[PDB]
RNA sequence: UAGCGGGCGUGGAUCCCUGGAUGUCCGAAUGGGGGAACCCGGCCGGCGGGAACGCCGGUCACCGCGCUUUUUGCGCGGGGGGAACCUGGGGAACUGAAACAUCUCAGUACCCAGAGGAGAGGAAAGAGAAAUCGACUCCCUGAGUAGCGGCGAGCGAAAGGGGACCAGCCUAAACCGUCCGGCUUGUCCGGGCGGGGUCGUGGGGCCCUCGGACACCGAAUCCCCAGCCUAGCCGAAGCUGUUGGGAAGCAGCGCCAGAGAGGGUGAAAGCCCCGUAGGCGAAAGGUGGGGGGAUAGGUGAGGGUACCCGAGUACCCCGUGGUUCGUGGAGCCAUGGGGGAAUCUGGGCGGACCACCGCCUAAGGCUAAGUACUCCGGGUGACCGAUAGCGCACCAGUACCGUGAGGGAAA
RNA sequence: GCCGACCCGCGAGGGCGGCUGGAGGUAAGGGAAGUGCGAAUGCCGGCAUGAGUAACGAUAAAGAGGGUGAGAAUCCCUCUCGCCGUAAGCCCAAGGGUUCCUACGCAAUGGUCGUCAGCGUAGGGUUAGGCGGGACCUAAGGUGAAGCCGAAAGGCGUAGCCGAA
RNA sequence: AACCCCCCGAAGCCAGGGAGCCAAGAAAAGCCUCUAAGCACAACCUGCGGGAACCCGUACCGCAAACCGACACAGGUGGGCGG
């Protein structure tokens, strides 16, 4: 179990941005160590990766109809990549 | 389970009302509200459609769903019972007095 | 309390005052007491060590009986609280 | 019907077997990630994979 | 639960039953901490370049009992939960008495500990007037009797009779043997284990005379099966007209019935659909002396000896409780305080006490059934039909209210 | 259910006829009860009167031009005027929990209006070895091996542990 | 882009400053030092090189229309700056 600390790249302008620098950032497992995505991105993408950052993000509260609903709780990280290199998987 | 019933996907008559007597292929059966889609019961939908994907719909008079209960099987002999009887080593089933 | 030897749980229990003759009448005045089971300590020493017995003025006597009882038994080797437990 | 095929496959993937479900597995995982990363950009997912490939994991780790 | 999107199924999917797997975190919550769902960690192993760092798997709470050389360890067990029922420990007041204090409400309400599909009780130191009965519980009766009672208000037994169920066992002690340690070496003292012994027409121990093995009785423990629960399956007999949006209505001619309960189908159908009567069915899990088998265990006559027959106990007195019993002439049962025995010429009881006659053998334990309840499943109703019926027919113990315990709708 | 000037009954009531309504109803003769409402400052709900009334929540105060827009006293812009300035400005802690930002939108919420919004839909947004806290310490207090006490529940309580602005 | 003189000046800093007074003014760890067991190829101490450095909070409101007052309520809410 590896592939299942990183869960999906985040799609924003804001990690768009980051792309131009060496910070790719994206959706994590809410429970993980910044230690344990390191290796784990890591391994995940023949990068080497310097720097990491982590946020939790409290899921907004949508609903429906006359029910209440409570969005699930999510976990950014954005990570710098060793000067001079790049995952051509979240360039596209 | 249980939910099992009549006839399935094959030939059947219809003693229904609208389109009593009428006899055609049961292009369709639901069980959950436990009906059956023949050729009979095909009413006018004036809807454009629900989805905006695909401009055109279709004023189409499609075949609309019926009651499991007024359709009635069919064999050489028209509209029969359905009996059971277990083969030489399966289970099949024949109608009123014949086969299948 | 009372756990020992003895085993004897105070219990509460009326205690109703009356006036009267006797050889005449006699009436009343009604209320719950409890009544409370004469025990003392009971030091003994017992192979090494010494030991003590929160125990009923009754079965006294029973504690120094046990205490002989205890002579055919082996035991040694920091044993304050075992020794009760292993003392019968 | 993919049932018997894949079973039958896992008692085979016993020439190296826990060891071999432990390299399989991993493997399946990445697929599975590398499937849901391009799932999320919309424009590399068609749906049945998913539920295909996360069973398969499953039966696997059995 | 439609829709966007994409799939699967007679190479038998979905679905239903059984067993297995995985099962984050909190919770008895158990490595430690803690504002439950979080934070920190020791030891062994693994992952990353991995020594720092992080992750992964395993393991580490406390108490009790037995084993172990104090110890460290090893094993079995405990903890928390449950609608009501049950048992024990503790235990009200309103109220009644047309005031109120005894009394009543009531050992009820409730707090607490414990038990379990039940729980309690249980093979006579009984009942009580019949030279009678024969464990225990439960129902009917006895009986609103006997009786208790500021003889007010009130409270209220038992024997016996009719029923349900049905069952009786183990041990302590004398006495024989063994292993251990203590000490004043002894035919001893104590401790643990084995045999023996288990009763009231009194029994047992040791010593004598005799016929018992192959005799018989036999489980409440273990074993096999039957049967049943947890999915299912078979299941008779109708077609044409006709009014109608729609026949199952109406008319015509038939048919089944171990099935004319009921429900559904465009409206009022035995024969259209699901059923119903009748009848089949389990590889798997659960249950199961109902049937059978096996083992544990148990079974005798007469005579001498007078060794043993449950101790701070019986018994007596002081204080109280229980019973119909409120100190009454006050026993019986139970026991907080003081005194304090005997082992069958023993000892308790038959309502003070004494004598007479008879009853029963205390001070260790276990025992099914009949009985109670209903969270759960099913069946039935001169039960409700959305202001009813559960607070909730509907995403309700919710919304909302309150610091909280708690309150609690509408629809 | 709505209507009736008809019929029978002393009466409660019954019947017939019309309109609605769209799937149930239940003679004669008997049986059993949750059986008849106008009042309970009754209970639940609905709708009235007061009444187009009182009020629109600080007497710091407004005006004009342009724009957007179906629609503007109330939204945007410009200029003018006014009010606060140990505050009516700025930062931190508690509490609050997405109200921040952007796009689209005005049924309701806003005491009027509303294109506006703290409002509805959706998307985005919170980055730490050094700041605050935890892998540090102790305070009152709390807990609590030992130990002591209490019918049960539990009460004290050393070491230790928890506890901070 | 200049970014320089002169003056006023803290209750704040140096800080464990000083003086006086009676009502007589926290604890523990860090840090230093002493030595036990143990150990002395260790270990500790200073310097350099290389590497390692987790968990949680961080929007916004915050004298108020976003907190406590059933309400965009003339009330209430601790600390700092406040020309
Ligand atoms: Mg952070
Ligand atoms: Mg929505
Ligand atoms: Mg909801
Ligand atoms: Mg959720
Ligand atoms: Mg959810
Ligand atoms: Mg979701
Ligand atoms: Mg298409
Ligand atoms: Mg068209
Ligand atoms: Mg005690
Ligand atoms: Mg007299
Ligand atoms: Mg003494
Ligand atoms: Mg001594
Ligand atoms: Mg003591
Ligand atoms: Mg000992
Ligand atoms: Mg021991
Ligand atoms: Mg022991
Ligand atoms: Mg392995
Ligand atoms: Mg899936
Ligand atoms: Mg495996
Ligand atoms: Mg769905
Ligand atoms: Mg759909
Ligand atoms: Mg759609
Ligand atoms: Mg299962
Ligand atoms: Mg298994
Ligand atoms: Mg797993
Ligand atoms: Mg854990
Ligand atoms: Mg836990
Ligand atoms: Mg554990
Ligand atoms: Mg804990
Ligand atoms: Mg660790
Ligand atoms: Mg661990
Ligand atoms: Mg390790
Ligand atoms: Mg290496
Ligand atoms: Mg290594
Ligand atoms: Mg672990
Ligand atoms: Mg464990
Ligand atoms: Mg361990
Ligand atoms: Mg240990
Ligand atoms: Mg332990
Ligand atoms: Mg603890
Ligand atoms: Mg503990
Ligand atoms: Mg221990
Ligand atoms: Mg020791
Ligand atoms: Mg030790
Ligand atoms: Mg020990
Ligand atoms: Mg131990
Ligand atoms: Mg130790
Ligand atoms: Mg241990
Ligand atoms: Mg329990
Ligand atoms: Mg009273
Ligand atoms: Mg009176
Ligand atoms: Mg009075
Ligand atoms: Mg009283
Ligand atoms: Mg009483
Ligand atoms: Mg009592
Ligand atoms: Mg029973
Ligand atoms: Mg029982
Ligand atoms: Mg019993
Ligand atoms: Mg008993
Ligand atoms: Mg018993
Ligand atoms: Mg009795
Ligand atoms: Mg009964
Ligand atoms: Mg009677
Ligand atoms: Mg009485
Ligand atoms: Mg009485
Ligand atoms: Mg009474
Ligand atoms: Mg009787
Ligand atoms: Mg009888
Ligand atoms: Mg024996
Ligand atoms: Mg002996
Ligand atoms: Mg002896
Ligand atoms: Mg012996
Ligand atoms: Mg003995
Ligand atoms: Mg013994
Ligand atoms: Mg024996
Ligand atoms: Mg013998
Ligand atoms: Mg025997
Ligand atoms: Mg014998
Ligand atoms: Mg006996
Ligand atoms: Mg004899
Ligand atoms: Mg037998
Ligand atoms: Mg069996
Ligand atoms: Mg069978
Ligand atoms: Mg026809
Ligand atoms: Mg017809
Ligand atoms: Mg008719
Ligand atoms: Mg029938
Ligand atoms: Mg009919
Ligand atoms: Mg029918
Ligand atoms: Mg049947
Ligand atoms: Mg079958
Ligand atoms: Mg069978
Ligand atoms: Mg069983
Ligand atoms: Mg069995
Ligand atoms: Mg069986
Ligand atoms: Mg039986
Ligand atoms: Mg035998
Ligand atoms: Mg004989
Ligand atoms: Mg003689
Ligand atoms: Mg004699
Ligand atoms: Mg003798
Ligand atoms: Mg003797
Ligand atoms: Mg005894
Ligand atoms: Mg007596
Ligand atoms: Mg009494
Ligand atoms: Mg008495
Ligand atoms: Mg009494
Ligand atoms: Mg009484
Ligand atoms: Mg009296
Ligand atoms: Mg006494
Ligand atoms: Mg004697
Ligand atoms: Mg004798
Ligand atoms: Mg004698
Ligand atoms: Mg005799
Ligand atoms: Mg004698
Ligand atoms: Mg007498
Ligand atoms: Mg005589
Ligand atoms: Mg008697
Ligand atoms: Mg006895
Ligand atoms: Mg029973
Ligand atoms: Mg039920
Ligand atoms: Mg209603
Ligand atoms: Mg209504
Ligand atoms: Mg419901
Ligand atoms: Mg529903
Ligand atoms: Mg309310
Ligand atoms: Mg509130
Ligand atoms: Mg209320
Ligand atoms: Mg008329
Ligand atoms: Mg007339
Ligand atoms: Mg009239
Ligand atoms: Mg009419
Ligand atoms: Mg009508
Ligand atoms: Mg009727
Ligand atoms: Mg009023
Ligand atoms: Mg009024
Ligand atoms: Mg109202
Ligand atoms: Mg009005
Ligand atoms: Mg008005
Ligand atoms: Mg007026
Ligand atoms: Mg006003
Ligand atoms: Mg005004
Ligand atoms: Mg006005
Ligand atoms: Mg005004
Ligand atoms: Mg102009
Ligand atoms: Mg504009
Ligand atoms: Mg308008
Ligand atoms: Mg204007
Ligand atoms: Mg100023
Ligand atoms: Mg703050
Ligand atoms: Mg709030
Ligand atoms: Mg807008
Ligand atoms: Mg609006
Ligand atoms: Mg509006
Ligand atoms: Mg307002
Ligand atoms: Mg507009
Ligand atoms: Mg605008
Ligand atoms: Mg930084
Ligand atoms: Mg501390
Ligand atoms: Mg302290
Ligand atoms: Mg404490
Ligand atoms: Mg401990
Ligand atoms: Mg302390
Ligand atoms: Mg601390
Ligand atoms: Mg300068
Ligand atoms: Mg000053
Ligand atoms: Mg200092
Ligand atoms: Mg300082
Ligand atoms: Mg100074
Ligand atoms: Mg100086
Ligand atoms: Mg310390
Ligand atoms: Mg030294
Ligand atoms: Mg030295
Ligand atoms: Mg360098
Ligand atoms: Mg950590
Ligand atoms: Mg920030
Ligand atoms: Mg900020
Ligand atoms: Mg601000
Ligand atoms: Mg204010
Ligand atoms: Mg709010
Ligand atoms: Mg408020
Ligand atoms: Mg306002
Ligand atoms: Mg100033």
């Given amino acids: 179990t590896a592939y299942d600390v990183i869960l999906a790249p985040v799609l924003s302008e804001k990690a768009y941005a980051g792309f131009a620098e060496g910070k790719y950032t994206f959706w994590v497992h809410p429970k993980a160590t910044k230690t344990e995505i390191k290796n784990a991105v890591e391994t995940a993408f023949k990068v080497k990766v310097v720097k990491v950052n982590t946020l939790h993000v409290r899921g907004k509260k949508k609903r429906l109809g006359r029910y209440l609903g409570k969005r699930p709780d999510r976990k950014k990280a954005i990570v710098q990549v060793a000067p001079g290199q790049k995952i051509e998987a979240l360039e596209g | 389970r249980v939910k099992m019933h009549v006839k399935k996907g094959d030939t059947v008559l219809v003693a229904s009302g609208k389109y009593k007597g009428r006899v055609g292929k049961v292009k369709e059966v639901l069980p959950k509200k436990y009906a059956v889609i023949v050729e009979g019961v095909n009413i006018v939908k004036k809807a454009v459609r629900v989805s905006p994907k695909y401009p055109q719909g279709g004023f189409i008079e499609k075949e609309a769903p019926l009651h499991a209960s007024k359709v009635r099987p069919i064999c050489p002999a028209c509209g029969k019972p359905t009996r059971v009887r277990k083969k030489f080593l399966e289970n099949g089933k024949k109608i009123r007095v014949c086969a299948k | ?88 | 019907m993919k049932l018997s095929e894949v079973r039958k496959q896992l008692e085979e993937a016993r020439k190296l077997s826990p060891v071999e479900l432990e390299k399989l597995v991993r493997e399946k995982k990445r697929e599975l990630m590398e499937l849901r990363f391009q799932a999320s950009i919309g424009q590399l997912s068609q749906n049945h994979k998913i539920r295909d490939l996360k069973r398969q994991i499953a039966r696997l780790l059995t």
């Fill in chain 3, 1 to 88: 309390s009372g756990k020992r030897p003895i085993v004897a749980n105070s219990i509460q229990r009326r205690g109703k005052a009356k006036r009267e003759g006797g050889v005449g009448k006699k009436t009343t005045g009604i209320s719950k007491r409890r009544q409370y089971p004469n025990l003392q300590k009971v030091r003994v020493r017992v192979a090494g060590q010494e030991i003590t017995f929160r125990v009923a003025a009754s079965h006294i006597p029973k504690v120094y009986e046990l205490v002989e009882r205890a002579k055919g038994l082996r035991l040694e080797g920091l044993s304050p609280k075992e020794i009760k437990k292993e003392l019968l």
